[PDB]
């Protein structure tokens, strides 16, 4: 878990090999690339309440808002189970208006 201890980047495993008077480690490491650009926001205001992401981050390609994990890109629609509410949003800086979908209501129809 300590960074740069074994390899450059995130670590997966290693294999040892012998030598005349030493040892040789082959480290397998994970490295990301082929980035993108996105517009973010630290919270979401809806129905007078503030919603924060459980684990992830908010992104937007201009007209829609999604939640994705930090180290990879896989958009998901903002439900009400992967986000948790905390108080009202009049003191947070950077809030953005939007709507948050919920699963129970369509299934009750």
């Amino acid at each position: 878990k300590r960074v740069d201890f074994c390899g450059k980047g995130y670590h997966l495993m290693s294999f040892p090999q012998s030598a005349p008077h030493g040892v040789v480690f082959l480290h397998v490491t994970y490295v990301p690339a082929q980035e993108k650009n996105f517009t973010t926001a630290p919270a979401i205001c809806h129905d007078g309440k503030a919603h924060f992401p459980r684990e992830g981050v908010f992104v937007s390609n201009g007209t829609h808002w999604f939640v994705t994990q930090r180290n990879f890109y896989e958009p998901q629609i903002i439900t009400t189970d992967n986000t948790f509410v905390s108080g009202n949003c009049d003191v947070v800086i950077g809030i953005v208006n939007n709507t948050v979908y919920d699963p129970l209501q369509p299934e009750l129809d």
Binding site: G9, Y10, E35, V92, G94
Partner: protein
């Protein structure tokens, strides 16, 4: 670990608070107090040196 990835500072402090167990909800509601704490502490250490 690779190529530098830009990130706003507050959303980095939120990750660093998540790293120690305190939920990120704490930081966004106490940002000004933490900023003042940081500035005062750095001023005090400058004076001490």
């Amino acid at each position: 670990a690779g190529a530098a990835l830009q990130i706003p500072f507050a959303m980095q402090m939120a990750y660093r608070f998540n790293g120690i167990g305190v939920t990120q909800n704490v930081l966004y509601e106490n940002q000004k107090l933490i900023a003042n704490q940081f500035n005062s502490a750095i001023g005090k250490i400058q004076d001490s040196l």
